[PDB]
Structures are given as structure tokens and as C-alpha cells.
Structure 1
Amino acid sequence: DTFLEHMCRLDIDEPPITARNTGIICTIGPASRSVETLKEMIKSGMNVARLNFSHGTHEYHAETIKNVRTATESFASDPILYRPVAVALDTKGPEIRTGLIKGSGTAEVELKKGATLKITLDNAYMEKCDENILWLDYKNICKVVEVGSKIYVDDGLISLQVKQKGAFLVTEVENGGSLGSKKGVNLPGAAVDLPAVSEKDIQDLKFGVEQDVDMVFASFIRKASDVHEVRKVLGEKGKNIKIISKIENHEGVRRFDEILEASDGIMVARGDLGIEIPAEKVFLAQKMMIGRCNRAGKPVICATQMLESMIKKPRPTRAEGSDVANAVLDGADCIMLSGETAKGDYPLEAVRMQHLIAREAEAAIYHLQLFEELRRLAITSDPTEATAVGAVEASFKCCSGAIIVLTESGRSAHQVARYRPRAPIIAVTRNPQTARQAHLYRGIFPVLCKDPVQEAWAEDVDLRVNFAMNVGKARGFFKKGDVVIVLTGWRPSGFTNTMRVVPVP
């Protein structure tokens, strides 16, 4: 009857439903890029493969994408159990990085508090960085930094303070540590002039169209003009690639609504965000963006350091278990793993842990309160909209095993997902890209029908409907005698305006 009361009723012994609704995005790298590991990644719950273009070459990422597809297509030959896997390109963007440490002896020079460290832009030191001279790739740094400005290195773990300036920078180490090679540099409060879409970004995005990626995670989006530039580079033939704008700076937060209108989805990139803005404020930015994306019906991803300790450990910290649960409770459509699957020692346990936590968090959601709050914040005239709210309400009413949705664009399924049913949304599609991109929206279980299209539209409709029925049975979503809502089109669909309540045969 109230949020506190429902929160008092939570029971660790009540088991969740079989379906896990939140998507899991795994950054692929050396720990996960083999075909055989990728097969186990999919079996453990991976829905999207993220490729970070801050590193690597096109030849290298081309191979990974080929291995990702090879592992994905091995589970074909059973369309009932086949799980679509999407491919995401994450851009480098206007990123600032140090150079390579001097390779003589060991790596990781030690930076000590109070020590002086000169920062240079002279490429003679580009591969000879040490505890005296440090090179970085931002060629205009000595025009957006002043005496007293603080420079952050390696995920903000190292802080520096500019003590002298020049057309170099003499700093003093404030927070000390071990300095590795090519580490990320953040300049909070400074107006970094780097472009939104660099020359490399153009190249990386065009390679994304040739590789038929399903979505782009665009880094450091500060405003809608940045999103439009990504959109233009993708141009036509990239027109269906979803753009997920990553919010990781203060301007991106302040201009979020502008960015959200231009974008197909949002990523809370808390790594960069928590250095650019004070780390105590990230939770406010996350919940605001997830809430705003929820009311707009647009996918939102929670990212960056969700299970960070599982790079080295087989079990997460209690904060990391809490973070994944709270992100699902916040309403995130997808959760992300970055170094935990790309480079760490326990990538499959990390994927498995996210699957377990998210399923338990989905059970803990007070569904009607969300549904009522989502209904209030939206009286439109779209029959497919009304059909979607009606299908969700009918699903609570009869405790539906699933809402089966027939769509080739995904829009019909996406509209159901906005209203957050408990029952899984089995989205039957013949479009493979739609099956892949459907993982961006919580609760959609994309199934790719490969049967040839029947002569009678009515016979083709129950074919795809029946296929959803065998899909749901085999995966444990429902059994015979249960009831499911089926959403189909008007006539040879258009408006998705035909809802039925069907017992499972």
C-alpha cells in the first residue's frame, strides 16, 4: 500500500521468475574474444557485445566481431533456443590520454605527493614517459589550463596541480600513485576544445557501417549538435544504427534533455562522469537520467565499474552487488560490464552475477506503482500505444506468462516495454537487426522467425504466434494451460492494435 510497506515485505526466500528482463552488455577484449569463451558468454547471459574503439585496430575488432557472430550463429539450428546478440561500437571521442612509459626495466613509475612532474606535448617523449616528464595527446592543453588547475590521471586516481605554464606544464603531484601507459586524463572545469567527432571517429563510425553494427555508444556527447554529427557520419546506410549518447561530463548532464531528444538512447558512463563531476553526485545524475529516459520510452544503460573487483576476484563486493540491483531498481534497461569481461580473470562469473542480481531486482519492483506512475506521466491517440498499455494491464490482471508481440520494427514491443510489464515480452520478428537491437529495451526477448512467409496472412500470424508459444515453453516462461497476451497487426500489420488473451495450448 506504500513504498516502505512493500519494502518491508521483501523476502529473500521468494524465488524470482525465470525470465531476466534487463539487458547485459559485455565489453569484449582479450579475456572474452575467443569463439569458445564467447559461446559461454552468450550462455551466461550476454545480450550485447561492446567493442571499445579507444583501443585496438580495425583488423583486431573485425576479428572479434567475426568471432562474436561465429559464437552467436552456433546456437542457430534451433530458432526456439537461439538468442540474438547485438554488436555495439563505442567511440574514442574527444579523449585525452598519456603516452607510453619508458620500457627500460619495469613498468609503472611511482608518482609521490609533493613531487614535481613536468607535462610535455613534445612527441620525443611520447613513448618515454616517466616520473619526471609526462606526455599527453591534447595539443591545446596549455590554452585551457591555468595555474592552480587540477589534472587527473588513470580514472582520477592520480591528481596533479599546475604550478607553471608554457607553450609545457610543470605540475606538483597531489594524489600519488603508479603511472601506467596511455592512461586517461580528465580536465574538470576546463573548456576542452577537442572535437566531438574527430577524424578517427569518422573512420571508426564508417567501419561500423561496413561491419553492420547495431548501435553506437558515442562518447562525451555534450549537446545535440554532437549527436547530429554522429548521425551525419553514419548517414544513409547507417540510418537504422541506434545512437546511444554517453553522458560523461557536466555539459552533457546540463543539456541532457536536448541530447535525449536527438538520441535513440542514453548511457550513464559513470567512469568519466565521476571524475568530471564530484563523485558524490553521480547517483543523482544516474537516477535523473534513468527516470527521464523511462518517461520518454528511450533505452538507458548503466555502465562502468558495476562489478569492478571481479576483474581479479571470483565474487563481487557487497557494494557491487548493491549497485547492480539498485540500477535495475532505478529502471535501467541494460547494465554494462567493461574491464570485468574485456580483460579480467572471471568474465563468465561477472556475466553470471549480473544475470542473478538483475533477476532478483526485477522481482523486487513494486510493479503497479511504476505502471501507475508511468501511466500518469504519459492520453495519446496512438492505437498501438493504447493497445500496449492495455496489454500490460491485462498481463497483471491474469498473471500472464508472456506478452507475445509480432513486430518487424520492434516499435510495438518497445511500447510495451516502456510500461514495464512483469511478464516477458516475446517479440517475434523476421528482421534480424530488430531482433538484435531489441536487447536495448528491458523485458523484450527477441526471437527470430526464419520460417518462410505463409500464403495466408492469417496463417502466417498464428505461425509466428505458435512459434512464440514453443519459445516460451522451452525456456520456462510458461506451460500449457497458462494464459498469454498476443499482440498482432490490424490487417495485412500497420497499427499494432489487436490484443488477445489466449490460453497456452
Structure 2
Amino acid sequence: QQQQLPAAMADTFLEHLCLLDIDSEPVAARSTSIIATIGPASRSVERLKEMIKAGMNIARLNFSHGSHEYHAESIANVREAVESFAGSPLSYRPVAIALDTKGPGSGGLSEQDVRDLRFGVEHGVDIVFASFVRKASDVAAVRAALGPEGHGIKIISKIENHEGVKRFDEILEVSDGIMVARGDLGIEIPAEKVFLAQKMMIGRCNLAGKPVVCATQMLESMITKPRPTRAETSDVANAVLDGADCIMLSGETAKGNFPVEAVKMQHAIAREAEAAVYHRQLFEELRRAAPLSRDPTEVTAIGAVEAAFKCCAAAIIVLTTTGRSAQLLSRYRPRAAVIAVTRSAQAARQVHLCRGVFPLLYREPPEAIWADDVDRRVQFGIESGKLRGFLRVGDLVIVVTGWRPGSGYTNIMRVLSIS
């Protein structure tokens, strides 16, 4: 069978590895988001359309280079390329915009970072990748620099030195997520210890249910070569197997000769690696480690993921205002795709940070009766799922909704047969 299902049914991790089959083709949609750095080699609207088709989910703007005018033009080109597919939900795919800060340099929040963060708020960026975060107060400073208008922007703290690793727990507590920034980390600590920091941080983020990005030199040789090395494909596959929500491309897309091919390579590897995840052990460990909760969204999420595994559900369709109900489903790593139907364009872009969440931006007219409005959003998830290949007639889906309008009231799980 397909999608490494014989290896998925194994009783031990060793037997799971022994049953991995190169002829077992991946069938599920790619769950791990790809962050591509937008620069000189990937700035044109035409090139950006090809990157979106290749699989780019998040566009990264590196404020260590360029200028405010240069990056504003890159942002406008990303938005133009994204909106060129808005004529049909099959082609349409939201793309988040992330601002990566220059950092503190010689040393706390620098004055250039305050100006760049203000630029991000004014240009409506979705995420901030904060460079060289070494303590909780660095995150509070970034949050303060975003002001009252940037309250919805996600802060992903980049761990790049020994202090960031040692104070990881306090940093994760106040951040929306983490980036394992391996370039600086590999210079700040011995190169042979970076894999320990990566695996530890990914594990702790998976336990906390917060997004984690693996970054830097993943496909480095593709800056000049059309095909990556054996170590590079292995690195991408292992970041997904480690539990990374996102994988990143830096020079490979910002300045390289093969930006589109680098995105295609990360897409192909991630799909293969996701099918090779040993869900039997992973779900059992995530379930056991996740604390008991009296929050109905948390309780519904584990019930929905358990139900999805019981029937081999093709998808879990969830309604979300902020992305939170989809994030709580994602933390249990279901094999079923989490189709998140939202009216918030920003939540649709941001939800790419969570593995296995497929955002659908709802732009249909409202129904007068709220229960009918909910039902049409569910049917929209199903129709978009059928169109995109996620669902077929006869499939079972799990539908996650709330008892009243507004964020924070998810409390219902329903088992539905498609058509």
C-alpha cells in the first residue's frame, strides 16, 4: 500500500524503519510549510508565481540586506503574484509575509530593528523572525516595538547562540514559535553540537504545541547546482522527521541560480518524509505528554484527532477565527489534513506556521441564520477539498465547530460522510 502504510502499522520503531518502501508513493498533501527568502533572484512577479506553484507558503524578507524601499517592492510583487490566482480557489493559496530582523549586533533591541519592525506593521506583515533572541525580555521589546497596531503579528524567536539555547524555556513561553537559526548557532556553539540543539528545540516546541522552523544551509549547494547533495536531501527529510513545522530556504532562493528548483526539492522531500513519520508512536507520545485540560477547544481537538485516526479520515475541517482551533489540532500531528476555513486573511496566512494546516480563505456571502452560515463554511471546506484532491465521495471527515459565534468557543466534533 501507498503513503508508507505498511511501515505505519509496525509494532516497533525498528520494524517501522525496516518496512519503509521507496515504491510506496506519497498520497497526502505536503504538510510542512516552505519558507522562501525573497531577494534579487526571486523578486519578479513572474518568478514569484512559479515559486507559489512550486510550493512556497511563507515569503521571508531579510532586513540584514536591502532597504525599506527594496523590501516594500518585494512585498508588493509577492502580493501581486498571490492575487493573480484569486480568480479560482483551486489556484488560490494564501502566502504569509515574514520580516526577519537584522538583530542586536554589539548589543537589546537595536534602533534599526525598531524602524524595521515599524515598517513591518505599516506594510501589514504577518510574522516577525526576531534575530538573536537570548532572553524573554528580548521578545517583550520586539512586541513593544510592534505597538498596538501589530498585536496580531506572530513573533518567531530565532535561537542563534548559547544563551538562547540555555534560556530556551523562558523564550518559548513568551514567543509564538521558534526558529532554529543554524547559521549563527553553528558559529556560536561547536558545529558538531547544532543537531542536539535542533532536535531538543523541535521536541520542546512539539510538546508545547508551538511552531518550530528549521533553517539555514538545508539545500546550500543548490545556490550554484541544479541538484542538491545526498547530505542536503537527508537534512531536509530529517528536519521533517524531527518534527519541524516549517523548513526554510535562504541563499537558495534569495540569490541562487535555482530558486524555483530549490522550492520544488523541499516540497518533494517533505512529502516523502511526512509519509515516513511513525504516527503510532508519535501520537501516543504526544497524547501522553500533553497535559489534562478543561479548555473545550483542547478537549475537542484531541477527540477529533483520535476520531480521525479511527476511521482513516481524509481530513479534519475546522472553522477558526484566529487559527487557534487549527493549531490545537496540528499539535497532535494527525495524518488527516487539517482544512482550516477562516474569514480572516491574516489568520489564513499565519496558519502556514502549523504543520498540516491547509488554510481556506472564505469569501462567500453570509447566511442570515448562524447555523446555516456554519454549514455553508463546512460545505465550502468539502468542495475545496474535493477540487484540490484532499477528498473524494465516500470519504469520512471530522468537522470541528463551536456552539456560538466568536473565537474561543470550539466544542463540537462531527463525523461526516462525503457526498
Q: Aligned partners of 1:368, 1:452: CA distance in 2, in Å? A: 42
Alignment counterpart, residue 62 of structure 2, candidates 44, 47, 52? 52
Tell me how many residue pairs correspond in the alignment.
407
Match of 1:171 in 2: none
After TM superposition, the structure 1 = structure 2 runs for residues 324-339 of structure 1, keeping only pairs within 5 Å, are 324-339=236-251
Alignment counterpart, residue 71 of structure 2, candidates 61, 68, 74? 61
Identity of matched residues, %? 74
How big is the shift at 1:50? Answer: 0.2
8 A Cα contact 1:428 1:468, kept in partner: yes
Q: Aligned partners of 1:30, 1:247: CA distance in 2, in Å? A: 26
Alignment counterpart, residue 456 of structure 1, candidates 352, 369, 391? 369
Q: Aligned partners of 2:212, 2:229: CA distance in 1, in Å? A: 24
Match of 2:171 in 1: 259
Question: How far does the alpha carbon of each residue in 1:343-401 deviate from its partner, in whole angstroms, 9 at most, with x for none?
Answer: 00001110000001001000001112111101111111111111101111111111111
After TM superposition, the structure 1 = structure 2 runs for residues 57-206 of structure 1, keeping only pairs within 5 Å, are 57-95=67-105, 194-206=106-118
8 A Cα contact 1:86 1:437, kept in partner: yes
Alignment counterpart, residue 191 of structure 2, candidates 240, 258, 279? 279
**Does 1:216 pair with 2:128?**
yes
Alignment counterpart, residue 160 of structure 2, candidates 211, 230, 248? 248
Match of 2:273 in 1: 361
Match of 1:293 in 2: 205
**Does 1:32 pair with 2:42?**
yes
Q: Aligned partners of 2:91, 2:354: CA distance in 1, in Å? A: 20
Q: Aligned partners of 2:288, 2:103: CA distance in 1, in Å? A: 38
Q: Aligned partners of 1:297, 1:382: CA distance in 2, in Å? A: 15
Q: Aligned partners of 1:202, 1:318: CA distance in 2, in Å? A: 41
The amino acid that maps onto 1:292 is R
Q: Aligned partners of 2:366, 2:202: CA distance in 1, in Å? A: 39
8 A Cα contact 1:80 1:471, kept in partner: yes
How big is the shift at 1:81? Answer: 3.6
Alignment counterpart, residue 404 of structure 1, candidates 300, 305, 317? 317
Q: Aligned partners of 2:118, 2:132: CA distance in 1, in Å? A: 19
The amino acid that maps onto 1:256 is F
8 A Cα contact 1:302 1:334, kept in partner: yes
8 A Cα contact 1:80 1:467, kept in partner: no
Match of 1:5 in 2: 15
Instruction: Identify unmatched segments of 5+ residues in structure 1.
Output: 96-193
> Any idea what SS the aligned residue of 2:23 has?
coil
> Any idea what SS the aligned residue of 2:97 has?
strand
Match of 2:30 in 1: 20
How big is the shift at 1:479? Answer: 0.6
Q: Aligned partners of 2:352, 2:274: CA distance in 1, in Å? A: 16
Q: Aligned partners of 1:423, 1:316: CA distance in 2, in Å? A: 30
Match of 1:370 in 2: 282
> Any idea what SS the aligned residue of 1:221 has?
coil
Q: Aligned partners of 1:196, 1:479: CA distance in 2, in Å? A: 53
8 A Cα contact 1:87 1:213, kept in partner: yes
Deviates more, 1:420-429 or 1:491-500: 491-500
Q: Aligned partners of 2:62, 2:363: CA distance in 1, in Å? A: 32
> Any idea what SS the aligned residue of 1:232 has?
helix
After TM superposition, the structure 1 = structure 2 runs for residues 346-357 of structure 1, keeping only pairs within 5 Å, are 346-357=258-269
Considering fraction of residues, name the structure with more helix. 2
Question: How far does the alpha carbon of each residue in 1:308-350 deviate from its partner, in whole angstroms, 9 at most, with x for none?
Answer: 0000111110000000000000000000000000000001110
Q: Aligned partners of 2:260, 2:108: CA distance in 1, in Å? A: 34
The amino acid that maps onto 1:381 is R
Q: Aligned partners of 1:483, 1:21: CA distance in 2, in Å? A: 19
Q: Aligned partners of 2:399, 2:142: CA distance in 1, in Å? A: 37
Q: Aligned partners of 1:369, 1:18: CA distance in 2, in Å? A: 20
**Does 1:503 pair with 2:408?**
no
Alignment counterpart, residue 340 of structure 2, candidates 410, 414, 427? 427
Alignment counterpart, residue 323 of structure 1, candidates 221, 235, 243? 235
TM superposition score normalised by structure 1: 0.80
8 A Cα contact 1:410 1:434, kept in partner: yes
**Does 1:235 pair with 2:147?**
yes
TM superposition score normalised by structure 2: 0.96
> Any idea what SS the aligned residue of 1:10 has?
coil
Question: How far does the alpha carbon of each residue in 1:93-145 deviate from its partner, in whole angstroms, 9 at most, with x for none?
Answer: 123xxxxxxxxxxxxxxxxxxxxxxxxxxxxxxxxxxxxxxxxxxxxxxxxxx
Match of 1:43 in 2: 53
Q: Aligned partners of 1:71, 1:81: CA distance in 2, in Å? A: 11
Instruction: Identify unmatched segments of 5+ residues in structure 2.
Output: 1-10
Q: Aligned partners of 1:80, 1:71: CA distance in 2, in Å? A: 15
Q: Aligned partners of 1:265, 1:383: CA distance in 2, in Å? A: 23
8 A Cα contact 1:435 1:447, kept in partner: yes
How big is the shift at 1:262? Answer: 1.1
Question: How far does the alpha carbon of each residue in 1:137-181 deviate from its partner, in whole angstroms, 9 at most, with x for none?
Answer: xxxxxxxxxxxxxxxxxxxxxxxxxxxxxxxxxxxxxxxxxxxxx
Q: Aligned partners of 1:81, 1:404: CA distance in 2, in Å? A: 19
How big is the shift at 1:78? Answer: 1.2
Match of 2:3 in 1: none
After TM superposition, the structure 1 = structure 2 runs for residues 383-394 of structure 1, keeping only pairs within 5 Å, are 383-394=296-307
Match of 2:379 in 1: 466
> Any idea what SS the aligned residue of 2:351 has?
helix
8 A Cα contact 1:196 1:220, kept in partner: no
8 A Cα contact 1:243 1:264, kept in partner: yes
Q: Aligned partners of 2:149, 2:208: CA distance in 1, in Å? A: 26
How big is the shift at 1:80? Answer: 4.3
How big is the shift at 1:77? Answer: 1.5
The amino acid that maps onto 2:214 is C
Larger radius of gyration: 1
Match of 2:226 in 1: 314
How big is the shift at 1:459? Answer: 1.2
8 A Cα contact 1:80 1:447, kept in partner: no
> Any idea what SS the aligned residue of 1:316 has?
coil
Alignment counterpart, residue 441 of structure 1, candidates 351, 354, 357? 354
Q: Aligned partners of 1:201, 1:70: CA distance in 2, in Å? A: 27
Q: Aligned partners of 1:284, 1:298: CA distance in 2, in Å? A: 19
Question: How far does the alpha carbon of each residue in 1:441-463 deviate from its partner, in whole angstroms, 9 at most, with x for none?
Answer: 00000000001221011111111
Match of 1:185 in 2: none
